[PDB]
UniProtKB/TrEMBL annotation, chain B:
UniProt KW keywords: Acetylation, Anion exchange, Cell membrane, Glycoprotein, Ion transport, Lipoprotein, Membrane, Palmitate, Phosphoprotein, Symport, Transmembrane, Transmembrane helix, Transport
Residues of the full protein shown: 399 to 906 of 930
Summary of the function given for this chain in its UniProt record: Functions both as a transporter that mediates electroneutral anion exchange across the cell membrane and as a structural protein. Component of the ankyrin-1 complex of the erythrocyte membrane; required for normal flexibility and stability of the erythrocyte membrane and for normal erythrocyte shape via the interactions of its cytoplasmic domain with cytoskeletal proteins, glycolytic enzymes, and hemoglobin. Functions as a transporter that mediates the 1:1 exchange of inorganic anions across the erythrocyte membrane.
Organism (species): Bos taurus (Bovine)
Protein's UniProt name: Anion exchange protein
Residues passing through the membrane, by range: 25-48, 60-91, 111-136, 143-165, 185-204, 224-244, 279-300, 321-344, 370-389, 396-420, 440-459, 466-488
Topology in the lipid bilayer: Multi-pass membrane protein
Family (UniProt): Belongs to the anion exchanger (TC 2.A.31) family.
GO cellular component, one term: basolateral plasma membrane
UniProt-recorded Gene Ontology molecular function terms: cytoskeletal protein binding; monoatomic anion transmembrane transporter activity; solute:inorganic anion antiporter activity; symporter activity
Domain named Bicarbonate transporter-like transmembrane: residues: 1-172, 183-497
Length: 451, 497
C-alpha cells in the first residue's frame, strides 16, 4: 500500500542517518577497530530479532550518544593501562548475561517509580553539552594537524593518513562545519514556517536532515582536486582492519594475552552498561513490560560475543513487518561502500552538533536557565513560576548547575573516569531526601513535576 | 520656490546640533564612515586604473570629504550622504575612451561638462525643479530600491567569485609573490577565511539585531549594545585576523599622499581653454550632451533617494527639502569637476542605511547635522588612520555589505509582496482589501513589478554603454502608471501604493 511505501522510506531515513554519524565518531574515537560498517550491520540483525519478539514492535532500537560516551570513556581507560579494547569489552558482555538471569527470577523495575524530571532532564542536558564540545575539540586537533603556514611541502603521500601538514584542509573543514550546520536549522525552520501548500512543506521538512547530506557532498564531489578526510569503510562482509579484528574473536585475545586479573574485574563496567540503558529505556515508553526490557539487555551482550557495541531504544498487524522492512534495508546498505566513502568526515560533525542543538531546545530545564539573564519584567506566563517567588527558581537552578559542573569535572579527568553514571545515580536520593529538606512539597510540585 | 526649503529647514538647523548628543549618533558615525569609505576605496582604485592615474583615489577622497562636509552644513536633508556610484563609473569609462580616441584631454572636457552642469541646475531650480518630483509614486520607488539591493548583493557576491578565481583551490606548491603591488599569484588557505569572516560579521550582526529586539538583558545598556553592534562585531573580528599572523589576507590600503595624491598630473591652476591640447571650441559646445546625460543620472538618483527617506511611513517628515539639496549636489559637483574632483551622487545603500542608524523601534528617527559632518571630516583624515586602517580586511567589510542589503530590503513592500507570492493564501496582510479582491491579481500585479525589474536587470549588464537605464526608469514606470488603469480600476490601484 502507498501508505506503507511512504512510511517505510521515512523511518528508514530516520534510522539511516544516526548510524552513519555515530560510526564516524567511533571511527575517530577508536583508531579503526570500531567504525560504521559493523554498526550498520548490527542494526540490521537488531531490527529483525526485536520485531519477531517484542511487546511494541513499532519501536525502534537505535543508538544513543550517552551510550557512545561509555565506550570512549572505556577506550580512554583502556589506554591508561595495557589492555585490549575489543577483548575487554567482550568479557563485559559475558558479565551482562548473568545479570539477566538475576532479573529473570525477580523484576528490578522498582527504580522506574523513582525516576524524576530533576533526574532525566539533568542527564540529557549534559549530553548535548558533550556533543558541542567534541565537535569543538576536533578543530583544535585539526589546527594542530594542519597548522597554518605557506605552501612549503611537495607531493605528500596521504593514502593511509596525511603524513604532513598540508594546505586547504584546516579551513575547508571549517566551512563544512557551518555549511552543513547552517543548512540544518533553516530546513528545521522551514518545517516550522508556512511555505509549500500545507503537506507540500512538511514532506521535505520532515526529510531536512536526510536531504541536507548531499548538497555539500556534491560540492565535495565537485572538489576532487582537494583532499578531505573521508570514511574508512572496508568492502562488503569484511571487518575494518581485518588484521586487527575478525568476525570471530578469541576471548583470550588475538595479539596479546588478556590479563588474568581482568576476567573477573569486568563486573563493575558491566553493571554501568545496564544502568545507562535501563534509564533510557523508560523515556521512550512515555509516549503512551519486563520481558521487553530484559530482552534488550540480553541481546546487548549478544553483540559482545563478536565484539560488537550495543544499541538503545529510540522513538517509534503490520507492526511486525514494519521492523522487518527497515532491518533488511539496513543490511543491504553495507553494499554501497565505494560510493559512501566519498563523503568526508567533516560532514558528519556538523550534523552531530546539530543533533545536540535540536535536543537542547526540547529541554524545559534550559528554558528557565535563559530566564536567569532575562530581566524580571518579561518572563513568560507558565503555570509553574507564577505562584512562586522569583528568587526561588534561581536557587533551584543553582542546585541544577552545580550537578552539571561536577559531572563536567569527572568526565574531564582521564585518571578517574568511567564513574560518570555512578555519580549520577546517587543524585536521585538527593532529590528524594535533600531537596524536600529545603523546598516545600507544594513548591516542588511545579519544578520537577513530570507529565 | 527654493526659498520654501530654506525657510523650512533653517529653524531646525540650530536645533539639530543639540539633537546630536545621543550616544547613538556616535555609533552612527562609525557605521557610515566605513560604509562610505570602502566603496570609494574600491571605486577610486578601479577609477584610477581606468583613468590611468589622472584622477586617483585621493581626488575621489577629496571630493568625498569636502562635498560631504559642506552639504552636511547647508543641506536641507543632512541625513543624505553623497559619494560616487557604479553607474557614474560607466560614464567615466566611456568619456576618456571617447576623449582619447578623439585626442581630447579628459580633465579639460570634464571641466567643461561641469560648466554645463552648473548652468543646467540653475535653470531647473528656478523653474520648479521638484514639480515633476511630486509625480513620482511608490510604484517607482520600490522598483529602484529593490534593484539596487539585488545589484549590491550580487556585486558584493561577485567579489566572492573574484577571490575564488584569483586564488583557485589546488594541491600545487606555491612560492612567495611579494604582493608589494598586489599578490601576483594564487596562495592557499586564504580564500575561505574571507568567507568565514564575512559570514561571521553577518551572523553576529543579525543576532544582535534580534538581541536588541529581544527581551534579553535589561533596559538602556541592552539598547546601547544593539546600537553599537556592527562596529563591535567588526572590531572583535578585526581582532580575529590580528591574532592569526601565519597567512596573508587582503586588507585595506591607504594612499600615502596626505597633501594630495597623484599631484603630478594635477595642475595648480587648471585652464579651461586647454593645458597641452588647446581644447577646440567645437568640443566645449558639444560637452552639453554628456553633461545632460550626467544630469539625468544624478538628478533621478538624488530625488528618489530623498523621496524614499522622506516617505510618510517614516517619522522623518520634519525638515525636508528637495530644491535646496538639488543645487548642492550638482553645483558643488560642477565645482569639483572644474577643480579636478569627480562629481558625486546619493546612493540608496549608504543614504537609507544612514537613516536606519538613527532609527528606533517603530519609534521616531533621529535627525543630526554633525554626524554627516564628522564622517566627511574623517574621510579627509583617513590618510592619518592609514596604519591602523591597514589592518582592516575586505572580508569583514564584505559581510556587512550583505547586512545593509538585507536590512534595506525589510522596508520594501514589494519585497513583502514578493514574499507573499510564496506565502500560502491562509495568511493575510494588514490590508485585506488588496489581497481579498485580488487573490490572483496580486501575483499578476507583482509580475508587472517583476517584468520591469527583469527588463532593468538586463539593461545594466549589456555588452555596451548601459547609461540608458535612467531613461528606462522614466520610460516604463511613468508610462506604466497611465497604462495601469487600462487593466484595473482606481480603487483597485490606489490601495497598493
Amino acid at each position: 500500500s502507498p501508505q506503507v511505501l511512504s512510511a517505510i522510506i521515512f523511518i528508514y531515513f530516520a534510522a539511516l542517518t544516526p548510524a552513519i554519524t555515530f560510526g564516524g565518531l567511533l571511527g575517530d574515537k577508536t583508531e579503526n577497530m570500531i567504525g560504521v560498517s559493523e554498526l550498520l550491520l548490527s542494526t540490521a540483525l537488531q531490527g529483525i530479532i526485536f520485531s519477531l519478539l517484542g511487546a511494541q514492535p513499532l519501536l525502534v532500537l537505535g543508538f544513543s550518544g550517552p551510550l557512545l560516551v561509555f565506550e570512549e570513556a572505556f577506550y580512554s581507560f583502556c589506554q591508561t593501562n595495557n589492555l585490549e579494547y575489543i577483548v575487554g569489552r567482550v568479557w563485559i558482555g559475558f558479565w551482562l548475561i548473568l545479570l539477566v538471569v538475576l532479573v529473570v527470577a525477580f523484576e528490578g523495575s522498582f527504580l522506574v517509580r523513582f525516576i524524576s524530571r530533576y533526574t532525566q532532564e539533568i542527564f540529557s542536558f549534559l549530553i548535548s553539552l558533550i556533543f558541542i564540545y567534541e565537535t569543538f575539540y576536533k578543530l583544535v586537533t585539526i589546527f594542530q594537524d594542519h597548522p597554518l603556514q605557506k605552501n612549503y611541502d611537495h607531493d605528500v603521500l596521504t593514502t593511509p593518513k596525511p603524513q604532513a601538514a598540508l594546505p586547504n584542509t584546516a579551513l575547508l573543514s571549517l566551512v563544512l562545519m557551518a555549511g552543513t550546520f547552517f543548512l540544518a536549522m533553516m530546513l528545521r525552520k522551514f518545517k516550522n514556517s508556512s511555505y509549500f501548500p500545507g503537506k507540500l512543506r512538511r514532506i521535505i521538512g520532515d526529510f531536512g536532515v536526510p536531504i541536507s547530506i548531499l548538497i555539500m557532498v556534491m560540492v565535495d564531489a565537485l572538489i576532487q582536486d582537494t583532499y578531505t578526510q573521508k570514511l574508512s569503510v572496508p568492502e562488503g562482509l569484511s571487518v575494518s582492519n581485518p588484521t586487527e579484528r575478525d568476525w570471530l574473536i578469541h576471548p583470550l585475545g588475538i595479539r596479546v594475552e588478556f590479563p588474568i586479573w581482568m576476567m573477573f574485574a569486568s563486573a563493575l563496567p558491566a553493571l554501568l552498561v545496564f544502568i545507562l540503558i535501563f534509564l533510557e529505556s523508560q523515556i521512550t515508553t512515555l509516549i503512551i513490560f519486563h520481558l521487553d526490557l530484559l530482552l534488550i539487555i540480553g541481546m546487548g551482550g549478544v553483540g559482545a560475543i563478536f565484539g560488537m557495541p550495543w544499541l538503545s531504544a529510540t522513538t517509534v498487524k503490520e507492526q511486525r513487518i514494519s521492523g522487518l522492512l527497515v532491518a533488511v534495508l539496513v543490511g543491504v546498505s553495507i553494499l554501497m561502500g565505494p560510493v559512501l566513502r566519498h563523503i568526508p568526515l567533516a560532514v558528519l560533525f556538523g550534523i552531530f552538533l546539530y543533533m545536540g542543538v535540536t535536543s537542547l531546545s526540547g529541554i524545559q530545564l534550559f528554558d528557565r536557565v535563559l530566564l536567569l539573564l532575562k530581566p524580571r519584567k518579561y518572563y513568560p506566563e507558565v503555570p509553574y513560576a507564577r505562584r512562586v517567588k522569583t528568587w526561588r527558581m534561581h536557587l533551584f537552578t543553582i542546585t541544577q548547575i552545580v550537578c552539571l559542573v561536577v559531572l563536567w569535572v569527572v568526565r574531564s579527568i582521564k585518571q578517574i573516569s568511567l564513574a560518570l553514571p555512578f555519580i549520577l545515580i546517587l543524585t536521585v536520593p538527593l532529590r528524594r531526601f535533600l531537596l524536600p529538606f529545603i523546598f516545600r512539597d507544594m513548591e516542588l510540585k511545579l519544578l520537577d513535576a513530570d507529565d
